[PDB]
Each structure stands twice: as structure tokens, then as C-alpha cells.
């Protein structure tokens, strides 16, 4: 262990992923990561709705950390003195101490370094879990995911290699924002001030917002994910507290590790997949048609009314064999 | 493609499926279908509760279209002048232009003809998706499903052929009917009139009714599905906007393509399967016992309080080896 | 059948399971069980909230009956004179008469004996189902599960034997307890007085309590489940009416029969699995780290707010290779 190569990796904010190789380069190594926890107010919709976010590395969701099976993930978690809450981290990819949550409880002004062997391959969720207030921190955006790639990269049901040209991390967040008697969303001074009202909303099990990358439309318009005809894309998706059902309108999930675990054969030709709360999944797809696509949570109410919708701008040539308008909309 | 044989198919109302062959009869063909959109009031319960349904071919759900892999489904969608809204169709089985929704936007008085190559085998959902009014149209019953059978028919995980004697299509719909201040369901003289009230109910993510084939008890009594001991039946099930967990009371799902995709091996000996919102699944089962069966969404509250329950009247001889009353209810 | 050996089994209260063999002891036999139905007031939390439970063998959930494939489960169901309602039982593992429900309808003062062939291997849910009062009986705790082990014990998806050292049965219950105008849960003299109000809550599809083994924290403290480093544990989990997503915080589900059916290959390296309402599942795990583990329903709100959280006390030596605190929380 002590003789293993140590490698520091620079993280990038989602939906983008930091530099990495699908197939492992070299032997096992201790991959070092560092994340600063930021408690800050963020606007989650076009109506100026604020949320006292608790974010790993300052983003909702936290950045995607990529390592290979049997590598060690050594994370340095820092909680600035400017924060008002104690935080920790639970890596679903880790084994022991509640995923590491019991070994990383840091108060404002403290940091900690946790190391764990990524023994299982797949996309895993990680989240803050302070004893007594687990749901609150998580639904406040304090969660993300990591990808433990098999040493030999991805493969389909029959060992055939699956290599993606691009990879996007879509973190889905269910928010529970309190509203006053008039139906208007409330704003609070400090995070703690919202606790009571937030819990009452949480118990209804009905989120007020279900978003991608921290806000409604965060992945639409000019911030739409891109691709080209013939391009192979891996779309990692996560939900740390509630179920979701990803769907690529106009496309499919050619290979979908619905459970997120690479040793579990992927489903194929998926129209809509399911990811349970507290888990991550990965869908592989080769775009065949150009144009705009809508990647959504297929409970269309949560998608188009609550905000769980994203876009894909794909360049290339249209394929009239696959689809064609024989007669355009006419009288 | 122009040289490919063409065949006009006659659609039938669910739970029945139009004539077709499990094994493809000949090479790829352009299978033609035609559906007229009908906006109509439908009564969903014995309390007289009405819903302004937007139905493909006049039924909720829309009719099941059957084709084989690599065939071309050419649909002529018609929106009569008698309608008030613009409609389109998204085939989850299709690839490109938002499943076709982007090429099929027809206003009242218009029609369009869309053709796509059914490249992936399985049961797929199809539904209307007008930009900005997507969920509303879907929860108004404007959705259905199609089945792209493999050229060589159905097979289990080990390649053994699975030939069914009967096939049924159960479309499950989640309605959100507004109520006045007295708890009485409201009635409207027009679709647009209910819109505002409906959206508010939709946002609670709690349907007022969850029904099979458009209404409570729709598939019972005169409309109870039939079978006979020894008969093999395929029960196709769809839910375009919300999760469901089909269960045959008194029976099982011998083979269940939970994801609805035939290239994804079916689960076996299922008691209750799960179909996420925005997808369709299929269950193959051979009846062993005579009598009535209850096909339900296994959230017993949704099944028996909300309306998600159907029946099966099976004929045949009882099997005392499988089950027997050693001591009938007595003192 | 009469010539087959018979064995009377003494059931034990969950989360424990009665003595049995993983690999079948000889040939097919008629395994006899007896359960007396008890309508009783139970407290579901520390505040003293009571529920007029309907419990098989007097426990919520009912006890786990264990037999082998092709064995005959002969159950003597007794409904005491002291009871006020008619009860029956629906074995999801059984084939015919609504899972046995239609042949076991017994009124207070009556008993019945039902026998069915356990033709399919896996864990199955069993619950009361009085026609017209189905969901009310189930959400009142009248449900449990059975395990039909393959005659050759468990095996992974590749045929390698999977022999557990311990086995626990976690029955998850979704309760719908009415509240008064002050938000305080209501208490009733007779269960009948609760029906109307309870039905109202049930219709919201939002349980007030989601608990393991009949109450919040029922499987914690001195009642916490136990294991040791290197010990293989099988955790059978069931939910007869609502979805759940089991997760062992700090561990994984090495082999998980998410559908609960043994003839369906298990998913591996699971972080969080999914069990649809009206079904049971099983997870196999070999502990590697000592300490406390939280076995929860991963919708953290349901887990830590609603009561779906259990504990595991694991003895043994810490494995620093798997996980270690390089730097404990410090400045
Ligand atoms: Cu935190
Ligand atoms: Cu977790
Ligand atoms: Cu429409
Ligand atoms: Cu769709
Ligand atoms: Cu009962
Ligand atoms: Cu049942």
C-alpha cells in the first residue's frame, strides 16, 4: 500500500468530468482528491427561489470522481470556519464506518483525510450524513457520485468493449422549499432557520423542485450537453434520496447499467430506465440523428412542471431511413 | 424502402390487439397505421367523475400497434377540425426528432404521415408531447404503446421459443381530477377550462385516480379478460408518466421483460414486477388454475382505492396438487 | 401427497427465522405451520402512537415460513372469537384461488387449513386480503413473507454455491395514522372507529410512518441485528404495499435477488437495491468491517424521518486496507 503511486487529480464541475482513462493506466494507485465544502444561497428557478445549499466543492451535485477498481481514493475534505454546520461524507463505494461518514465528521474550521479501497466497479453515490440530520444535508444538495471504472474499461454483456467518446454526469436533486400562507417560497437568513419548515415539507415526500445540476434549466439552452452523429456518450445519473427514471427523448439507452454496477450486465435498447433513491446509474448511447434531444426524468410532471429536464444538441446528418416525414403537417 | 412491401393494418381497441403473426411473415415491410385524435369527455368512476381525454384513435390508452424488428411503421395521424388543441406523437421506439414529436405537430384540421424504422425489439410507449404542454396531454390519456416483435418471435433467456396463445394490452393511466372546496370532483365544459386546476393537482404528484383502460372497473365483468387453464398469455402493460408494479393475484409472471426490451433477458417466476413511468413491460404466463384472477398495480391503495384493478376469468379444471382446501373455513 | 412425510414447524418472531436447512433434507414433504390472527393495539413510536394492528401470529410483520421448492406448505390459519373481522391469506408463492385468499376466508371463531405446492423458488409476500377491505388490512400490518429455497440451496448467477451463516427477515410497514387538528396522531377505542379517517390518509399515498418490525427503531439498540467480520448474512426484505430501496450504510449487497426470485440471476455489488410494493427481495453480504451499520430504506426522509432505519452491530477487527483515517478531523 505505502509503495503505491500517489496521484492528485484536478476536479471539474458537473456535468463535465475530470481527465481520466477508461482503461487503467499503470498499476493500482492512491488517487488524491480535495473538496472544500461551501454553504451558500443559490437560486433554483426563474422565480428567484433561494436554497441554502450545502455543496461539496461548491457545486450541486458534487463533482464526479473517477478511479479504477482496486485503486485507493484519498479525499481531503475541508470545512471552512466560515461555515456554520458540521459535515462528513458517506461514499457508497466504500466499505466501513458508514461509508466513511463516521471517520470524517468535521466542524467549521476542520479538515480530514479519508482513504478507502475502491473494491467494487460501478457508479456510486456519495453524500453528507451527519448523524441526526442525514436527509436535510442530502436534500440541500450535499451529494454527488464517483465512478469506479473496471481496470479494463467498460464491456457489454458478452465481454465486447464499450468505449465512450464523451461522458456527462447528471446529478438529480429533489428540493423541498417551504412556502408561506400565500403560496410564496420563503427565504431565510441562515441554513438553520429553514430546518423546521423544511422538514415539514420533506415529510410530505413531495419535492417542490426536481432539478438537474442544481437548477431548473441548468442543462438547457446554451448550457445543453453536446454530441455528434456517430458519437458514443456515457451519461452517468444519480439521485441520493429519491427515485428517478431517466429517458432520452428521441433516443435510447443502448446499454444501461441501471443498478450502476459494472459487474451486473447492462440492459439493452432501453427506452426509460430506473434508478432508485440512494443510487447511481450509467447509460451508454451512440447518437444516430442530429437535432435537439430532451433528457428527462420520465415522470413528465417532475420533468416539465418540477424542472427535471435537460437538452442535448447533436450535430450531423439526418437519417431518413431511421425516420422521415412522409407528409409534413398539412390540411 | 420504396420497393419494400406495404401492409395496411386495422387497429382494435385495448385490451385487444390487432391481428399479427408472432414470427415475421416475410422480409421487412412498411406497416401502415392510421389514428384519428379525439378529444372527448370520459367518465372514470361510478361517481360520475369526468376527464377531458385526448385520445389516440378514440381510446385511453391508444391502440397497441404491432410490427417486427426492422419493419417501418408509417403512421398517418389525423387531428380533426373538431379538436381545439395541437397534438403530435412521440414513439419511444423511434429514433430522431423527439421520437417523431418534432415532425408530427398538427393543428386541428391537419394531418401528417410519419415513418420510422423499428430497429429495437420490445414494447415501447408512445404519447403526445406538445412543447410546453407535455405532461398535461399525457395525463389526459393521450398515450399508448407499440410492440416491435423479434423477426423470429419471442424467446426466453436460453433461446427457447415462447409462443403465446393470447395477448392483452393494459394501459395504466394516472388522472389528476380537480375538486371544489367541498371535495366534489369538478366538471368542465372544455379542456382548456380545466387546465389551470389540473396543473395544481398534477404538482402534488398524487393522482386522484389510477385506472386501467380509462376508468375504474373498465377491465372487469363484461370487459374482464379471458383465459383457460393451459393457455399462455402475454400481458403488455404501459404507464407513460408514472411508476407501476403489476401483479397477477393467484398467478405469476413466468417470464417478465420488466424493461419491456426483448434483447434484455426476462425475469422469471415473478410475483410482482416494476414498470417505471415512461415505459412498458410484458409478462408471459401459462394459467394453471381456473377461476377469477385480479391483475393489479400492487400498491393496494392505488389498486383498490384509486381504481387500478382488472380481472381475468379463466376456465378449466382445478388442480388440487397445486392448491387444495384441506379444511374449509369452519369452527 | 398423503404418503409424503410431514413436519410441524415452530415459527419464530421476526427478524429471526425458524430453524431450517439451506439444502433440502431429503425429498418433498408437507411442511406444516399454524398461525393465530390477533387484532391488537401496538405502539409504533416513542411518542406512544398506537395502531390497531391485524397481525399474523401476533407480529408485524408476520413470521417467515421457510420451505423448499416442490414442498407442500400446509397452513392452519385460526381467527379467534375475540377478533371482530373476517380474515384470509394470499400467498404470492401459491398458484390459484387468489393466492389462497378465496379459500381461506374465516370469520372470528373459525379456522381453516390450506395446502399449496411451493413450485417456484424465492422469497414471496403473503398478506390478508378480505374483498373490499384489502389495502386496509395490509397497511394495518397483516402481511409477511415466506422463503421457498431451492432444494440445492442458494447459488449465484454462475452456479457457485452461496451458503449464508445467518439470515434475518426485515418486514417493512407503511402506516397511515390519522392526526387531529393539532397535528397529533389520533387514538381509537375500536379499530372500526379508525377506518374512515385512515382511508383518507391512505388516499394521500403518503405514509406517516415507514417502519421495520412494527415500530420506529424496532431493530436498533439491544434489538439491533448482529454479525461479525467474515460472516455471510442473508437479509430478506418485504413490503406488501409500497416500494422500498434497501441499503446497508457502510456495506453493500454482494448478491441481491432484487425481484426476490432465485431463478432470476442476482445483481452484484449493489449499493442500493429496489423492491416494488407487493414483493420481497433478498440480499447476501459478507461483512468486512466491524462497527455499527445502518440498514435503511434509502429515501433518507423515509429512513430517518419516517422510521425506516435498522442497525447492525458487527464485531471483529478493523481493516485499514479497505478504509483508514489518514487525518482525523482537525484544524
Ligand atoms: Cu453536510
Ligand atoms: Cu447513502
Ligand atoms: Cu395531445
Ligand atoms: Cu416519452
Ligand atoms: Cu385480515
Ligand atoms: Cu398481494
Amino acid at each position: 500500500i505505502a509503495a503505491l503511486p500517489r496521484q492528485k487529480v484536478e476536479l471539474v464541475d458537473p456535468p463535465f468530468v475530470h481527465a481520466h482513462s477508461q482503461v487503467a493506466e499503470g498499476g493500482p494507485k492512491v488517487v488524491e482528491f480535495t473538496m472544500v465544502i461551501e454553504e451558500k444561497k443559490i437560486v433554483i428557478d426563474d422565480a428567484g427561489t433561494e436554497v441554502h445549499a450545502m455543496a461539496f466543492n461548491g457545486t450541486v451535485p458534487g463533482p464526479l470522481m473517477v478511479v479504477h477498481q482496486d485503486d485507493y481514493l484519498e479525499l481531503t475534505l475541508i470545512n471552512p470556519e466560515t461555515n456554520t454546520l458540521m459535515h462528513n461524507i458517506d461514499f457508497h463505494a466504500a466499505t466501513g464506518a458508514l461509508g466513511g461518514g463516521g471517520l470524517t465528521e468535521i466542524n467549521p474550521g476542520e479538515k480530514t483525510i479519508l482513504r478507502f479501497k475502491a473494491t467494487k466497479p460501478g457508479v456510486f453515490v456519495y453524500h453528507c450524513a451527519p448523524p441526526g440530520m442525514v436527509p436535510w444535508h442530502v436534500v440541500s444538495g450535499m451529494n454527488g457520485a464517483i465512478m469506479v471504472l473496471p481496470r479494463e474499461g467498460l464491456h457489454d454483456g458478452k465481454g465486447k468493449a464499450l468505449t465512450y467518446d464523451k461522458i456527462y454526469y447528471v446529478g438529480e436533486q429533489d428540493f423541498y422549499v417551504p412556502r408561506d400562507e400565500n403560496g410564496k417560497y420563503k427565504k431565510y437568513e441562515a441554513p438553520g432557520d429553514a430546518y423546521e419548515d423544511t422538514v415539514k415539507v420533506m415529510r410530505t415526500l413531495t419535492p417542490t423542485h426536481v432539478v438537474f445540476n442544481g437548477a431548473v434549466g441548468a442543462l438547457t439552452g446554451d448550457k445543453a450537453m453536446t454530441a455528434a452523429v456517430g458519437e458514443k456518450v456515457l451519461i452517468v445519473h444519480s439521485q441520493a434520496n429519491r427515485d428517478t427514471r431517466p429517458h432520452l427523448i428521441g433516443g435510447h439507452g443502448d446499454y444501461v447499467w441501471a443498478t450502476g454496477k459494472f459487474n451486473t450486465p447492462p440492459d439493452v435498447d432501453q427506452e426509460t430506465w430506473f434508478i432508485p433513491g440512494g443510487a447511481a446509474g450509467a447509460a451508454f448511447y451512440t447518437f444516430q440523428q442530429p437535432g435537439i434531444y430532451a433528457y428527462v426524468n420520465h415522470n413528465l410532471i417532475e420533468a416539465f412542471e418540477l424542472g427535471a429536464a435537460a437538452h442535448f444538441k447533436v450535430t450531423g446528418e439526418w437519417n431518413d431511413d431511421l425516420m422521415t416525414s412522409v407528409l409534413a403537417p398539412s390540411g
Side-chain angles (χ1 to χ4, degrees), chain A:
Chain A
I1 306 177
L4 290 182
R6 263 65 183 183
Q7 181 185 133
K8 297 183 179 180
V9 178
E10 294 177 316
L11 292 159
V12 307
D13 306 339
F16 298 100
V17 180
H18 68 73
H20 68 280
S21 54
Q22 292 168 65
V23 178
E25 292 178 327
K29 49 281 175 198
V30 180
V31 190
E32 304 160 298
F33 290 104
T34 293
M35 295 194 292
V36 182
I37 301 163
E38 293 178 28
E39 292 177 9
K40 58 190 184 72
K41 268 195 275 71
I42 61 173
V43 175
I44 63 180
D45 61 23
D46 58 28
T49 303
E50 299 188 310
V51 175
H52 282 275
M54 293 174 219
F56 284 114
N57 208 59
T59 58
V60 176
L64 185 73
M65 290 176 267
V66 187
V67 297
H68 285 89
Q69 190 191 148
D70 293 319
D71 279 334
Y72 296 75
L73 192 161
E74 185 162 296
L75 183 271
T76 291
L77 193 64
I78 304 166
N79 187 2
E81 58 186 292
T82 46
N83 281 339
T84 69
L85 306 165
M86 176 277 273
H87 303 283
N88 63 345
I89 189 169
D90 177 356
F91 278 103
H92 282 191
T95 300
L98 306 167
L103 296 172
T104 58
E105 294 178 29
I106 54 181
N107 296 111
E110 291 195 310
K111 65 178 175 185
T112 186
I113 303 183
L114 173 70
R115 192 194 73 200
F116 75 88
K117 192 175 187 172
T119 58
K120 303 172 178 294
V123 287
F124 297 84
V125 159
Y126 72 74
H127 60 93
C128 183
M133 58 203 43
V134 183
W136 193 48
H137 285 243
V138 180
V139 302
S140 284
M142 202 152 186
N143 61 85
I146 76 166
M147 183 169 65
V148 183
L149 281 160
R151 306 293 297 186
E152 71 293 334
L154 301 176
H155 291 92
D156 67 357
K158 193 179 174 176
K160 305 172 184 183
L162 287 175
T163 312
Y164 53 81
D165 297 306
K166 305 186 66 169
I167 177 180
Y168 286 107
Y169 169 44
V170 181
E172 186 173 325
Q173 186 63 56
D174 48 313
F175 285 126
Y176 302 82
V177 188
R179 290 180 276 224
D180 57 26
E181 61 188 315
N182 293 268
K184 288 81 178 74
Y185 291 109
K186 306 171 78 164
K187 289 166 183 162
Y188 307 79
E189 177 252 11
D193 292 339
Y195 194 89
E196 182 185 280
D197 298 349
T198 303
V199 174
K200 296 179 183 176
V201 180
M202 287 165 61
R203 290 178 169 274
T204 64
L205 300 176
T206 306
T208 57
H209 300 74
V210 186
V211 305
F212 287 159
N213 211 227
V216 175
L219 297 180
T220 63
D222 300 334
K223 302 184 190 182
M225 298 174 272
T226 55
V229 172
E231 204 155 69
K232 298 168 294 174
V233 184
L234 185 75
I235 307 172
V236 178
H237 197 125
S238 81
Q239 230 298 3
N241 183 68
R242 193 173 168 263
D243 303 328
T244 185
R245 51 209 66 72
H247 176 97
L248 184 58
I249 304 284
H252 297 101
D254 290 338
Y255 297 99
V256 178
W257 289 271
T259 65
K261 310 305 159 283
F262 301 141
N263 280 337
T264 295
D267 299 325
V268 295
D269 308 321
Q270 298 300 296
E271 67 180 310
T272 301
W273 42 110
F274 186 75
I275 299 175
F284 190 104
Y285 181 61
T286 305
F287 288 91
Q288 301 292 127
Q289 297 272 41
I292 193 170
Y293 288 73
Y295 180 78
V296 300
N297 166 327
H298 221 287
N299 171 304
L300 304 174
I301 300 174
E302 293 172 29
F304 300 104
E305 287 290 330
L306 276 37
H311 287 160
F312 266 92
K313 291 178 181 179
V314 183
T315 57
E317 294 300 280
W318 183 263
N319 185 324
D320 281 298
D321 176 32
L322 287 175
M323 182 178 286
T324 188
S325 188
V326 176
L327 171 62
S330 44

